Write a protein that binds this ligand. Structure first.
Ligand code: HEM
Lengths: 55, 431
C-alpha cells in the first residue's frame, strides 16, 4: 500500500508497474519462440511430421 | 554439299559425298512412338529388334553388310551399310527381308526369344539409368493424356501383353508408301539409286495412315520419385517450347546456348563465359548441368537437367538458375549474344558434318518427311547471324516470363521445395 489503505502512493506505484510488465512479457515470448524452433510444432494426428513438410 | 529430292511414286533423297569410304541406304517411316496408344506401347521397339535379330544379321554379314535401326517420337528408320561398290546388294537385302517376306522373321521361335531380350533391356533401363529416365518422366507429366507422353521403349506392363498379331496390325497401318522416304548417304550418286529402284517396281502398300484425334498440349505439373538409397539427386525442369517449322526455332536454340553445359571436374569447363557459374562454384551447388531446346511436330520443351551430391542446398541451385532466366527478358547484354552465336554455329556444324553416314541418313530422312526438303547449313548460318538482342527479349517475354513449368525428379530430393515456391521464381517483382 505504501501506507494504511489503498491511497495515493498505491495508485502511483501501480501505474509505474503497469508500464514495465508488458516488456517482461515480450522477453518471455522470445524465449517461448526459441524453444519452439528446436522441436517444431505438433499436428492433429499426434504422430511424427518429419515425412511431409511444406515451408 | 547438295541434297537431291525426286518423286516417281516413291520419294527418293540423297546426299552425295565422293570423299567417304562407305555408303548407306535405308528407309525412314513417318510414324514414331507418338502414333501408338497405351495398350500397344513398345510395338516400334519390338520391330527394331526383330530387324536386328541374329538370323537376319547373319544373312547380311555373309554379303558384307551391317544393320542399324532407330526409334524416335516422330519417325523410325531401318538402314543397311556397305562398301561403295556393293549398294546393289544392300538394296536387294532391304527388298527381300523387309518388304516381301515377313513370315520368316515373325516365326514363333524368333518372336519369343526377341521379346525376352527386350524385356531385360527395359528392366535394366528403369533401375540404373537415372538421368535418361528422369527426362522420360518429364515428357509423361508435361503432355499427360496426349500422344506425346508415351515412352519410346515402352513399359514393362505394356510389353508383356504384345503378341504377333499386334505387330502385323501396326505394320499394315504405318509401313506404307505414302509414309516413307528412301535415303542414301555417303559415296553414292543420285541417278544410280533411282535407276536401281526403277529397274524393279517396288511399292509397299497403297493408302494412308490413321489420323489421331488428340493434339499435343502442355500442362503444368510435377512427378516425384523419391529414393533415399541412391547417392545423388537428378532433376529436370522445362517450359513449353517450339515445334519444328516455327519462326522462333533458331532463337530458342540460341537462348539455351547462353547458359550452356557444365562439368565441375573438367578444368576448362570451369572457365566458361557464363554468369551463372559465379553462384554455383562458391558453394559447389552441383556436379553437372546442361540446357536443351527440343522440338517435335506439334510442340517442344525448353529447359535444363542437373545432377547433385549437395542435397541440403538444392533450393539454392533452382533459385539461382531461374533468376538468370529472368535476365533474358530484362537485361541480356550484347556480348552474351555474340558468344552464343559462335558456339551455336560450332555445335550445329559438328552435328551435320560428322563422318558417319548412318547419322546423316537419320537426319536427312526425318527432315524431308516433315518439310518436303532440307535446309542447307549455309542458309542456317545466315539466319543465326541476323538475330539481335531485341529478338531474344521478345521471345523470352512470351515463353519464359510468368509461365507454367513442369518438374521431374528422383533420388534424394527431400530438399526440393513444392510447386508454388518454384513457380513464383518465374517472375521478378522488380519489373
Ligand atoms: C503472449 C502469449 C503467447 C504467444 C505470443 C504465443 C505464441 C505461440 C506461437 C506463435 C506458437 C506456434 C504456433 C501455434 O501452435 O499456434 C505457440 C505454440 C505453443 N504455445 Fe504459445 N504463445 C503464447 C502463450 C502461451 C500460453 C499461455 C501457453 C500455455 C499455457 C502456451 C503454450 C504453447 C504450446 C504448448 C505450444 C505448442 C503447440 C503445438 O506445437 O502443438 N503459449 N505459441
Amino acid at each position: 500500500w505504501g501506507g494504511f489503505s489503498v491511497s495515493n502512493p498505491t495508485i502511483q506505484r501501480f501505474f509505474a508497474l503497469h508500464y514495465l510488465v508488458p516488456f517482461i512479457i515480450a522477453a518471455m515470448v522470445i524465449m517461448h519462440l526459441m524453444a519452439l524452433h528446436i522441436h517444431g510444432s505438433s499436428n492433429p494426428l499426434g504422430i511424427t511430421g518429419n515425412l511431409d513438410r511444406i515451408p | 554439299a547438295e541434297v537431291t529430292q525426286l518423286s516417281n511414286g516413291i520419294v527418293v533423297a540423297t546426299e552425295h559425298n565422293p570423299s567417304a569410304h562407305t555408303a548407306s541406304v535405308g528407309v525412314v517411316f513417318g510414324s514414331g512412338a507418338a502414333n501408338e496408344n497405351p495398350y500397344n506401347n513398345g510395338v516400334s521397339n519390338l520391330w527394331k529388334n526383330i530387324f536386328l535379330s541374329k538370323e537376319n544379321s547373319a544373312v547380311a554379314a555373309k554379303e558384307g553388310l551391317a544393320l542399324s535401326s532407330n526409334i524416335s517420337r516422330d519417325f523410325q528408320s531401318y538402314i543397311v551399310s556397305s562398301l561403295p561398290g556393293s549398294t546393289d546388294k544392300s538394296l536387294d537385302f532391304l527388298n527381300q527381308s523387309f518388304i516381301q517376306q515377313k513370315a520368316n522373321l515373325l516365326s514363333s521361335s524368333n518372336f519369343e526369344a526377341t521379346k525376352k531380350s527386350v524385356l531385360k533391356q527395359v528392366q535394366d533401363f528403369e533401375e540404373n539409368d537415372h538421368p535418361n529416365r528422369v527426362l522420360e518422366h518429364l515428357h509423361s507429366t508435361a503432355f499427360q493424356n496426349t500422344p506425346l507422353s508415351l515412352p519410346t521403349r515402352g513399359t514393362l506392363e505394356s510389353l508383356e501383353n504384345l503378341v504377333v498379331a499386334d505387330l502385323e496390325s501396326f505394320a499394315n497401318n504405318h509401313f506404307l508408301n505414302s509414309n516413307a522416304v528412301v535415303v542414301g548417304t555417303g559415296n553414292i550418286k543420285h541417278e544410280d539409286l533411282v535407276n536401281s529402284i526403277e529397274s524393279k517396281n517396288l511399292s509397299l502398300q497403297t493408302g494412308t495412315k490413321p489420323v489421331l484425334k488428340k493434339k499435343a498440349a502442355f500442362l503444368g505439373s510435377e512427378v516425384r520419385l523419391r529414393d533415399d538409397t541412391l547417392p545423388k539427386a537428378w532433376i529436370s525442369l522445362a517450359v513449353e517450347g517450339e515445334p519444328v517449322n516455327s519462326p522462333n526455332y533458331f532463337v530458342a536454340k540460341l537462348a539455351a546456348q547462353i547458359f550452356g553445359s557444365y562439368n565441375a571436374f573438367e578444368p576448362a569447363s570451369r572457365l566458361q563465359g557464363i554468369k551463372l557459374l559465379d553462384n554455383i562454384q562458391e558453394y559447389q551447388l552441383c556436379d553437372n548441368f546442361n540446357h536443351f531446346s527440343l522440338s517435335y511436330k506439334d510442340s517442344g520443351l525448353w529447359g535444363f537437367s542437373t545432377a547433385t551430391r549437395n542435397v541440403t542446398m538444392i533450393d539454392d541451385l533452382i533459385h539461382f538458375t531461374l533468376k538468370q532466366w529472368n535476365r533474358l527478358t530484362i537485361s541480356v547484354t550484347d556480348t552474351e549474344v555474340e558468344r552464343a552465336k559462335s558456339l551455336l554455329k560450332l555445335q550445329l556444324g559438328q552435328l551435320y558434318e560428322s563422318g558417319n553416314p548412318v547419322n546423316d541418313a537419320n537426319l536427312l530422312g526425318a527432315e524431308v518427311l516433315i518439310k518436303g526438303s532440307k535446309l542447307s547449313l549455309g542458309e542456317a548460318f545466315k539466319k543465326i547471324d541476323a538475330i539481335t538482342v531485341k529478338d531474344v527479349k521478345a521471345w523470352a517475354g512470351k515463353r519464359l516470363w510468368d509461365q507454367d513449368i513442369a518438374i521431374a525428379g528422383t533420388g534424394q530430393i527431400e530438399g526440393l521445395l513444392d510447386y508454388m515456391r518454384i513457380r513464383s521464381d518465374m517472375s521478378m517483382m522488380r519489373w
